[PDB]
Design a protein around this ligand. Structure first.
Ligand SMILES: [Cl-]
Ligand SMILES: [Cl-]
Ligand SMILES: [Cl-]
Ligand SMILES: [Cl-]
Length: 126
């Protein structure tokens, strides 16, 4: 399903995302827009790894999909748990990734389309 922008804003605010590892709500909204386009079932199969769900979490380092060579399962979850309408597993796993990296550099979509920009538009009007 698609999680509307302002719904996602409220979900992340009510989960303590503002200030989390120095990040902002706008950072995460812009991240989602450029990674999954707000789709809980977003999916990219790059070949050596697959990315799952609203935060495009990676089967090489963070979730087990049973079909990625050279993998570790840093979030100790099946990737299929990141393809559901329930964002709890996504939130827990994304927080662990961002805590590991002390920020959002794991997400190229955020580096390329968000970092160092005016992100007002992502968080206004809710
Ligand atoms: Cl909730
Ligand atoms: Cl807040
Ligand atoms: Cl960051
Ligand atoms: Cl708001």
């Amino acid at each position: 399903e698609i999680i509307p922008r302002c719904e996602l804003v409220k979900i992340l605010r009510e989960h303590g995302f503002e200030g989390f590892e120095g990040t902002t709500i706008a950072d995460w909204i812009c991240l989602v827009q450029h990674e999954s386009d707000y789709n809980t079932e977003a999916y990219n199969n790059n070949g050596p790894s697959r990315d799952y769900g609203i935060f495009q979490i990676n089967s090489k380092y963070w979730c087990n999909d049973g079909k990625t060579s050279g993998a570790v399962d840093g979030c100790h979850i099946s990737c299929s748990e990141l393809m559901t309408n329930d964002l709890e597993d996504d939130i827990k796993c994304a927080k662990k990734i961002a805590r590991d990296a002390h920020g959002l550099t794991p997400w190229y979509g955020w580096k390329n389309h968000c970092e160092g920009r005016d992100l007002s538009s992502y968080v206004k009007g809710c």
